[PDB]
C-alpha cells in the first residue's frame with residue numbers, strides 16, 4: 529500500500545500546464561522514478577479530468593518497450609500521483625535544440641521505435657495516440673525512445689473507426705483534424721511525419737505565429753525540404769505528410785506495415801527494433817541514478833515542498849477518482 533510518505537523527493541524535472549514531475553526515490557527499495565503530481569482541484573477546474581483518467585487507463589493497460597512504464601498510481605485527498613520509470617535521457621527537444629538537426633540514421637532509429645510503439649497501440653490496443661509532438665518524446669538511460677503523456681489517447685478505435693474530438697497542439701494538427709469533419713488513426717502518421725521532419729530538418733514543416741495562418745499552411749501548403757535532405761527521407765516525409773489521409777503513408781488498411789516497408793527503413797528488422805537490438809546512436813552520459821544533466825536547470829534548481837484523516841473525502845473540487853489504486857504486478 530503506497531503513499532507520498534514512501535518516497536524521497538529529490539529534484540524538480542519539469543512543470544507542465546496541469547502539474548509537475550519530480551525525481552523521487554522509493555525509500556524501501558532504493559529505486560528511482562519520475563513522479564507526476566497533479567492537483568485534483570486544478571484538473572477539475574481546467575476540465576482535464578477525462579484526459580487524466582484516460583492517461584491512467586492507457587498506462588495501466590499497455591506494456592511496450594517504447595512507452596513510459598507506470599509503476600504506481602495513487603491519490604491523496606488533494607493529489608493524483610503517477611510513479612513512472614525515470615527517462616534519464618530527458619526530452620528529445622533538449623538534444624535536438626542543441627544539435628540543430630539529427631543525422632538521417634539517428635532520425636531513422638528514433639522513427640522506427642516510434643512506429644513500433646504506434647503499431648502496438650493501433651493493432652494491439654485499438655488506441656489512437658493523437659498527441660504525437662516532439663515534446664512527448666524522451667530518451668531512457670540507454671538512449672531508446674519513450675513516448676510519454678497519454679491524456680489525448682482514444683480507446684476502442686478498431687480499424688477504420690472515426691473520431692471527432694478536436695485536440696492536439698496547433699503546430700502538430702493533421703489537416704483532417706483541422707477540417708473538423710471526423711478523422712481516423714492515420715492522424716498518428718501525420719504526427720510521425722512532423723516529428724521526423726523536425727529531427728531531420730531542424731524546424732517545423734509549417735509555422736506561423738498566427739494560428740489562422742498556421743492552419744492555412746497545414747491544410748493547403750505543399751511540404752518543402754532543405755535541399756541537403758536525401759531522396760528516401762524526402763519520400764518518407766512526403767508520404768507521411770500527405771494532406772489526404774487516404775493518400776498518406778500508413779493511411780490504408782495495412783496501417784504501420786506500409787511505413788515499415790518504405791525504403792527509408794530498408795534493412796531494418798522490425799523484431800529487432802522491438803527487442804532493443806539496435807544500438808542507440810546516442811547514449812545518455814549520466815553518471816549517477818540521480819544525474820539530471822538532460823533536464824533544464826530552470827526546473828532542477830527549484831526547491832521542492834509538501835504542496836506547491838482524509839482517506840475517504842470525495843468532494844466536487846476534489847473527487848475520489850476510480851482506478852487510482854494501482855501497483856504494477858511484479
Ligand SMILES: CC(C)NC[C@@H](C(=O)N1CCN(c2ncnc3c2[C@H](C)C[C@H]3O)CC1)c1ccc(Cl)cc1
Nearest residue numbers: 541542543544547548549562596612613614615676
Ligand atoms: C517543454 C515543457 C513545457 N515540458 C513539460 C513536461 C516536462 O517538463 N517533462 C520533463 C519531466 N518529465 C519526465 N521526466 C522524466 N521521466 C519521465 C517524465 C515523464 C513523466 C515520463 C517519465 O519517463 C515529463 C516531461 C511536463 C509534462 C507534464 C507535466 Cl505534469 C510536467 C512537465
